[PDB]
Amino acid sequence: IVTQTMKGLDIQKVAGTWYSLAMAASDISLLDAQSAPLRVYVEELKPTPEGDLEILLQKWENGECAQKKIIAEKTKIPAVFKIDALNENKVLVLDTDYKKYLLFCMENSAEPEQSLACQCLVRTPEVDDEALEKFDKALKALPMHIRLSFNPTQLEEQCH
Numbered sequence: 001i002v003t004q005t006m007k008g009l010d011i012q013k014v015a016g017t018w019y020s021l022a023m024a025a026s027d028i029s030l031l032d033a034q035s036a037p038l039r040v041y042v043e044e045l046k047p048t049p050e051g052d053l054e055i056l057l058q059k060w061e062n063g064e065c066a067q068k069k070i071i072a073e074k075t076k077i078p079a080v081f082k083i084d085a086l087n088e089n090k091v092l093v094l095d096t097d098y099k100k101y102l103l104f105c106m107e108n109s110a111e112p113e114q115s116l117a118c119q120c121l122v123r124t125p126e127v128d129d130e131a132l133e134k135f136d137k138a139l140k141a142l143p144m145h146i147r148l149s150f151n152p153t154q155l156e157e158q159c160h
């Protein structure tokens with residue numbers, strides 16, 4: 001598939017607060033503009049005891065910086081999950097040290113290469129150079145055509 005995904009992943013570790021530091025999409029249109037249909041801002045990851053992952057985020061739709069709730073259900077491979085929101089159905093965890101940074105992608109199995117959007121999340125509202133280093137290292141192999149990194153000030157702001 002599209003993954004170079006994480007092996008030996010404990011989902012329960014990723015629990016708590018997260019900030020969208022950086023994001024990137026094959027199709028420019030999806031991340032282009034604030035209102036773009038995959039311009040989502042992760043707030044918190046709440047992994048359920050079932051082994052699934054609930055994901056809390058902000059998306060700009062109509063005027064307000066709305067806040068949605070997506071549940072990524074566990075598949076065969078621990079590092080891949082089944083969502084059904086934002087016209088995506090897959091969530092791939094590429095890498096994470098749990099403590100600082102977490103790299104992941106969203107894509108539609110239907111059209112991966114047009115649907116693929118990948119975010120560098122961080123634990124602290126501070127642009128970590130280590131996180132971005134490993135993020136861009138992963139994105140070299142990917143066919144990304146838009147790339148967005150934010151600043152601590154943005155990361156605290158609402159649709160930051």
Ligand SMILES: [Ca+2]
Nearest residue numbers: 048049050052
């Ligand atoms: Ca559950």
